[PDB]
Design an enzyme around this catalytic site. Structure first.
Site, PDB file in Angstrom:
ATOM      1  N   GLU A 121       0.809  -1.212   0.000  1.00  0.00           N
ATOM      2  CA  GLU A 121       0.000   0.000   0.000  1.00  0.00           C
ATOM      3  C   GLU A 121       0.841   1.259   0.000  1.00  0.00           C
ATOM      4  O   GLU A 121       0.421   2.272  -0.578  1.00  0.00           O
ATOM      5  CB  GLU A 121      -0.981   0.023   1.181  1.00  0.00           C
ATOM      6  CG  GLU A 121      -0.463   0.577   2.508  1.00  0.00           C
ATOM      7  CD  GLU A 121      -1.606   0.802   3.503  1.00  0.00           C
ATOM      8  OE1 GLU A 121      -1.939   1.978   3.833  1.00  0.00           O
ATOM      9  OE2 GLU A 121      -2.143  -0.219   3.966  1.00  0.00           O
ATOM     10  N   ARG A 190       9.003   4.057   5.932  1.00  0.00           N
ATOM     11  CA  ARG A 190       7.857   4.444   6.754  1.00  0.00           C
ATOM     12  C   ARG A 190       8.397   4.861   8.114  1.00  0.00           C
ATOM     13  O   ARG A 190       8.766   4.011   8.944  1.00  0.00           O
ATOM     14  CB  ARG A 190       6.843   3.308   6.870  1.00  0.00           C
ATOM     15  CG  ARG A 190       5.564   3.702   7.599  1.00  0.00           C
ATOM     16  CD  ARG A 190       4.649   2.500   7.810  1.00  0.00           C
ATOM     17  NE  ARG A 190       3.316   2.895   8.280  1.00  0.00           N
ATOM     18  CZ  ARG A 190       2.952   2.959   9.570  1.00  0.00           C
ATOM     19  NH1 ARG A 190       3.826   2.700  10.529  1.00  0.00           N
ATOM     20  NH2 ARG A 190       1.718   3.313   9.892  1.00  0.00           N
TER      21      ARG A 190
HETATM   22  N1  LIG Z   1     -17.439   9.231   1.948  1.00  0.00           N
HETATM   23  C1  LIG Z   1     -16.613   8.967   2.975  1.00  0.00           C
HETATM   24  N2  LIG Z   1     -16.876   7.905   3.765  1.00  0.00           N
HETATM   25  C2  LIG Z   1     -16.054   7.645   4.789  1.00  0.00           C
HETATM   26  N3  LIG Z   1     -14.945   8.294   5.160  1.00  0.00           N
HETATM   27  C3  LIG Z   1     -14.710   9.337   4.357  1.00  0.00           C
HETATM   28  C4  LIG Z   1     -15.459   9.716   3.251  1.00  0.00           C
HETATM   29  N4  LIG Z   1     -14.906  10.828   2.642  1.00  0.00           N
HETATM   30  C5  LIG Z   1     -13.854  11.089   3.378  1.00  0.00           C
HETATM   31  N5  LIG Z   1     -13.671  10.227   4.424  1.00  0.00           N
HETATM   32  C6  LIG Z   1     -12.517  10.286   5.316  1.00  0.00           C
HETATM   33  O1  LIG Z   1     -11.459   9.575   4.678  1.00  0.00           O
HETATM   34  C7  LIG Z   1     -10.882   8.633   5.607  1.00  0.00           C
HETATM   35  C8  LIG Z   1     -10.392   7.416   4.856  1.00  0.00           C
HETATM   36  O2  LIG Z   1      -9.366   7.834   3.950  1.00  0.00           O
HETATM   37  P1  LIG Z   1      -8.654   6.789   2.981  1.00  0.00           P
HETATM   38  O3  LIG Z   1      -7.367   7.420   2.520  1.00  0.00           O
HETATM   39  O4  LIG Z   1      -9.593   6.350   1.878  1.00  0.00           O
HETATM   40  O5  LIG Z   1      -8.332   5.584   3.998  1.00  0.00           O
HETATM   41  P2  LIG Z   1      -8.349   4.015   3.840  1.00  0.00           P
HETATM   42  O6  LIG Z   1      -7.383   3.697   2.716  1.00  0.00           O
HETATM   43  O7  LIG Z   1      -9.749   3.504   3.646  1.00  0.00           O
HETATM   44  N6  LIG Z   1      -7.731   3.510   5.292  1.00  0.00           N
HETATM   45  P3  LIG Z   1      -6.219   2.839   5.587  1.00  0.00           P
HETATM   46  O8  LIG Z   1      -6.385   1.307   5.578  1.00  0.00           O
HETATM   47  O9  LIG Z   1      -5.856   3.365   6.986  1.00  0.00           O
HETATM   48  O10 LIG Z   1      -5.197   3.291   4.483  1.00  0.00           O
HETATM   49  C9  LIG Z   1     -11.980   8.345   6.617  1.00  0.00           C
HETATM   50  O11 LIG Z   1     -11.358   7.992   7.859  1.00  0.00           O
HETATM   51  C10 LIG Z   1     -12.704   9.697   6.722  1.00  0.00           C
HETATM   52  O12 LIG Z   1     -12.076  10.622   7.633  1.00  0.00           O
HETATM   53  C1  LIG Z   2      -1.155   0.918   7.408  1.00  0.00           C
HETATM   54  C2  LIG Z   2      -2.180   1.793   8.140  1.00  0.00           C
HETATM   55  C3  LIG Z   2      -3.622   1.231   8.161  1.00  0.00           C
HETATM   56  O1  LIG Z   2      -4.552   2.107   8.788  1.00  0.00           O
HETATM   57  C4  LIG Z   2      -1.691   2.067   9.562  1.00  0.00           C
HETATM   58  C5  LIG Z   2      -1.339   1.025  10.410  1.00  0.00           C
HETATM   59  C6  LIG Z   2      -0.916   1.319  11.697  1.00  0.00           C
HETATM   60  C7  LIG Z   2      -0.865   2.625  12.163  1.00  0.00           C
HETATM   61  C8  LIG Z   2      -0.405   2.942  13.570  1.00  0.00           C
HETATM   62  C9  LIG Z   2       1.102   3.043  13.641  1.00  0.00           C
HETATM   63  O2  LIG Z   2       1.815   3.143  12.722  1.00  0.00           O
HETATM   64  N1  LIG Z   2       1.666   3.016  14.921  1.00  0.00           N
HETATM   65  C10 LIG Z   2       3.064   3.076  15.099  1.00  0.00           C
HETATM   66  C11 LIG Z   2       3.416   4.055  16.188  1.00  0.00           C
HETATM   67  N2  LIG Z   2       2.657   3.751  17.435  1.00  0.00           N
HETATM   68  C12 LIG Z   2       3.239   3.946  18.716  1.00  0.00           C
HETATM   69  C13 LIG Z   2       2.442   3.730  19.842  1.00  0.00           C
HETATM   70  C14 LIG Z   2       3.098   3.936  21.078  1.00  0.00           C
HETATM   71  C15 LIG Z   2       4.445   4.320  21.032  1.00  0.00           C
HETATM   72  C16 LIG Z   2       5.174   4.519  22.336  1.00  0.00           C
HETATM   73  N3  LIG Z   2       5.663   4.673  23.345  1.00  0.00           N
HETATM   74  N4  LIG Z   2       5.105   4.494  19.924  1.00  0.00           N
HETATM   75  N5  LIG Z   2       4.485   4.320  18.755  1.00  0.00           N
HETATM   76  C17 LIG Z   2       1.192   3.610  17.278  1.00  0.00           C
HETATM   77  C18 LIG Z   2       0.805   2.851  16.034  1.00  0.00           C
HETATM   78  C19 LIG Z   2      -1.222   3.657  11.332  1.00  0.00           C
HETATM   79  C20 LIG Z   2      -1.633   3.371  10.046  1.00  0.00           C
HETATM   80 MG   LIG Z   3      -5.334   3.717   2.543  1.00  0.00          MG
END
Ligand SMILES: Nc1ncnc2c1ncn2[C@@H]1O[C@H](COP(=O)(O)OP(=O)(O)NP(=O)(O)O)[C@@H](O)[C@H]1O
Ligand SMILES: C[C@@H](CO)c1ccc(CC(=O)N2CCN(c3ccc(C#N)nn3)CC2)cc1
Ligand SMILES: [Mg+2]
Ligand SMILES: Nc1ncnc2c1ncn2[C@@H]1O[C@H](COP(=O)(O)OP(=O)(O)NP(=O)(O)O)[C@@H](O)[C@H]1O
Ligand SMILES: Nc1ncnc2c1ncn2[C@@H]1O[C@H](COP(=O)(O)OP(=O)(O)NP(=O)(O)O)[C@@H](O)[C@H]1O
Ligand SMILES: Nc1ncnc2c1ncn2[C@@H]1O[C@H](COP(=O)(O)OP(=O)(O)NP(=O)(O)O)[C@@H](O)[C@H]1O
Ligand SMILES: C[C@@H](CO)c1ccc(CC(=O)N2CCN(c3ccc(C#N)nn3)CC2)cc1
Ligand SMILES: [Mg+2]
Ligand SMILES: [Mg+2]
Ligand SMILES: [Mg+2]
EC number: 2.7.1.33
Lengths: 352, 352
Positions: A121, A190
């Protein structure tokens, strides 16, 4: 077969679809009816079912891709409705990214002879972002910033050149937040992530206000006053905290005035939505600022659908990143919002 | 006059009081009745009014201070009740810190001939922390850590030596969070702060659960399951996100499963309290981790009253800081919780 890339996230599915526009006379003949049906369905509708949307304004027109000319379309729908999508598909080489490429791998394989290729991703995000900026947004800049972000009478969207984009800090605000340090087209890391992301905004807003969509939450927030919920520096000091340069208007404690029962009884849903937006947006900016300082990177680009139709958060990020970095960091934004992973997945097709 | 130091914070007032225990025969005679009344009131009661508390277990006994021997007492009450305190005082040289030393300066001056000396809240924190560790906690270590914090059957509180305490990252978790990099007794910097602090825990908990005290919020959280509210990596990927070493149990989106109406209808108040605790605690740990990496400091000490009677958050910080830093950072804690600024203010008395 049709050319798709798909990013199945924790909340939204993003689909990029390349519509060929150089179909010859012989090719049209050799086109099977199911394929003509898909192309006409996708290009003659902007709403698909009850929850799919084509973002027509983002379409890239007359793009040359894999040696053909076509239009690149951008489509989104909730991950919760992926069962409808897969049922439609059962009634093709799919390059797929996001967590759902793994979580729903077995579901995609219920489509006979379908070939699923899972891609990373964040790799797809980087490849798609660099690609779209390289081809331009129909001749306009893909990247923009807010000029004079601290002065409301001046603040305005302006184009930003990324022709030499490295290094770059990329802050991907989806359900959760990933932060990338990009050093070249094939060298990134990352740095970290934060759990206080778009899903925290939407989930907390829903609990606190009863909103039933992202758009409703933003409408509420636009009408609210976050300072009715937040405890500010001036609430603790009576003014600025001068020794450390903290202005009285800075938030000392998000939702910190909600420890008082009488304030909880007076606060409006709109105030709570705006406090939720401000809390999440400032935390993302602050984490990005700390990561940029540590990575020695001064350009920070924010992407992901937390910011779609969300000028409030974009302007807050632009102001806050500039203010708290003393002008050393600049907030950048991209027109294609949350579609970069889907494009990056599509770009992997020639490898299969 | 009596020897006090006071830290008036955004939520709590902390008072340090030195009780002389070497009062001679002649000194007792020369002691005026109002002064004997204050000393007997403070030392014969552990509850003051309806909201003041003496933390008897923290008392430093037979401390030598300013050339006299005495007991150092630690007292707290809500800043909301400072009007009662000032009215009691009207019916002395006061060294005072915290924002309230400025906000309520004019109120303290309603006490006739009272001499208020305002001192900086982070200077007093550093001076008080170094002082208490130097004198020890009645012969025991003031500083501790959790050994084997990743293994519940092994995890246990153990003493930690700070005899050469520099450099040190100090994370002060009050209403809001300040982060200090301490290089020597007189050289430190406020690296940054975060608005997601103890007031966010208490304020959001109150909104989400109806709890009416910090202690109730912690009791609720102890019974809850944060994963009923949070969206985990495994909810998005079906498992770990292997490429970037993210375990399936990590939180991807705090409160992110609350975007689903049916989940909001099933979640308990206890689950929401625990999700609030986990969200705030992880964010503080993560910000501390990023600051420690940038400051090149490997010892991080967490203080402030967010952590009083809060072993859940202390253990989560100890585990999370160790886990996410790959063992490079160690979480440290101090027995005197949130009293360092009040002690640091008391230590300023000889300057006036
Ligand atoms: N129509 C919608 N429905 C839901 N969320 C929305 C919408 N439009 C905007 N959002 C926002 O967009 C966010 C999701 O963004 P997006 O980049 O598509 O994440 P994702 O890829 O689904 N999640 P991740 O697995 O963390 O990468 C949600 O958490 C909301 O804050
Ligand atoms: C890929 C995407 C999906 O949604 C996603 C996954 C995971 C996360 C959370 C993340 O990356 N984390 C790393 C840093 N984290 C902490 C927590 C406590 C301490 C201390 N002490 N340090 N680091 C929290 C989670 C985001 C997006
Ligand atoms: Mg995403
Ligand atoms: N694949 C593409 N399809 C459509 N427009 C594109 C594409 N790639 C780039 N563009 C845009 O069109 C402009 C011209 O691109 P292009 O025809 O490749 O010429 P060039 O890149 O400047 N020279 P060269 O690549 O060496 O042939 C670019 O600056 C972009 O704005
Ligand atoms: N002011 C104090 N009052 C009570 N106990 C103290 C005080 N300062 C330190 N202590 C504790 O008592 C121990 C002995 O302190 P102290 O009497 O000052 O001897 P010392 O510091 O080792 N040598 P010196 O300071 O050169 O006279 C310290 O290690 C602390 O644990
Ligand atoms: N009895 C209590 N009442 C209220 N909050 C409590 C109590 N016990 C613990 N807390 C927690 O302790 C936090 C306040 O810690 P404290 O270090 O005293 O901050 P403060 O000095 O009042 N605020 P600040 O101005 O930001 O330094 C609250 O936000 C709660 O999370
Ligand atoms: C003294 C104490 C009282 O309670 C206290 C005051 C203020 C704060 C908050 C704080 O120190 N802040 C600095 C960092 N902030 C941001 C925000 C956005 C961006 C970007 N982009 N960068 N930084 C937020 C506030 C805590 C404690
Ligand atoms: Mg070219
Ligand atoms: Mg304080
Ligand atoms: Mg000594």
């Amino acid at each position: 077969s049709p050319w798709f890339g798909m990013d199945i996230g924790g909340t939204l599915v993003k689909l990029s679809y390349f519509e060929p526009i150089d179909i010859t006379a012989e090719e049209e003949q050799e086109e099977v009816e199911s394929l003509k049906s898909i192309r006409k369905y996708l290009t003659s509708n902007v709403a698909y079912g009850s929850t799919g949307i084509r973002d027509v304004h983002l379409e890239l027109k007359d793009l040359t891709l894999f040696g053909r000319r076509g239009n690149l379309h951008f489509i989104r729908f909730p991950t919760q409705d992926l069962p409808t999508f897969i049922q439609m598909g059962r009634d093709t080489v799919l390059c797929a990214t996001g967590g759902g490429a793994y979580k729903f791998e077995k579901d995609f394989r219920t489509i006979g002879n379908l070939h699923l290729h899972k891609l990373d991703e964040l790799d797809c995000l980087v490849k798609g972002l660099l690609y779209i900026d390289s081809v331009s947004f129909n001749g306009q800049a893909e990247c923009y910033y807010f000029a004079n972000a601290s002065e409301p009478e001046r603040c305005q969207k302006m184009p930003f050149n990324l022709d030499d984009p490295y290094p770059l800090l990329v802050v991907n605000i989806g359900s959760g937040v990933s932060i990338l340090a990009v050093h070249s087209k094939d060298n990134y890391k990352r740095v970290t992530g934060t759990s206080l992301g778009g899903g925290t905004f939407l989930g907390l807003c829903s609990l606190l206000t009863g909103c039933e969509s992202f758009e409703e939450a933003l409408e509420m927030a636009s009408k609210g006053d976050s300072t009715q919920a937040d405890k500010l520096v001036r609430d603790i000091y009576g003014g600025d905290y001068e020794r450390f340069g903290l202005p009285g208007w800075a938030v000392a404690s998000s939702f910190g005035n909600m420890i008082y029962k009488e304030k909880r009884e007076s606060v409006s849903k709109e105030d709570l939505a705006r406090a939720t937006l401000v809390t999440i947006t400032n935390n993302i900016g602050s984490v990005a600022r700390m990561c940029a300082v540590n990575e020695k990177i001064n350009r920070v680009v924010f992407v992901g659908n937390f910011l779609r139709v969300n000028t409030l958060s974009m302007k807050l990020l632009a102001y806050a990143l500039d203010y708290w970095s003393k002008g050393q960091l600049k907030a950048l934004f991209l027109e294609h919002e949350g579609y970069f992973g889907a494009v990056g997945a599509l770009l992997g097709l020639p490898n299969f």
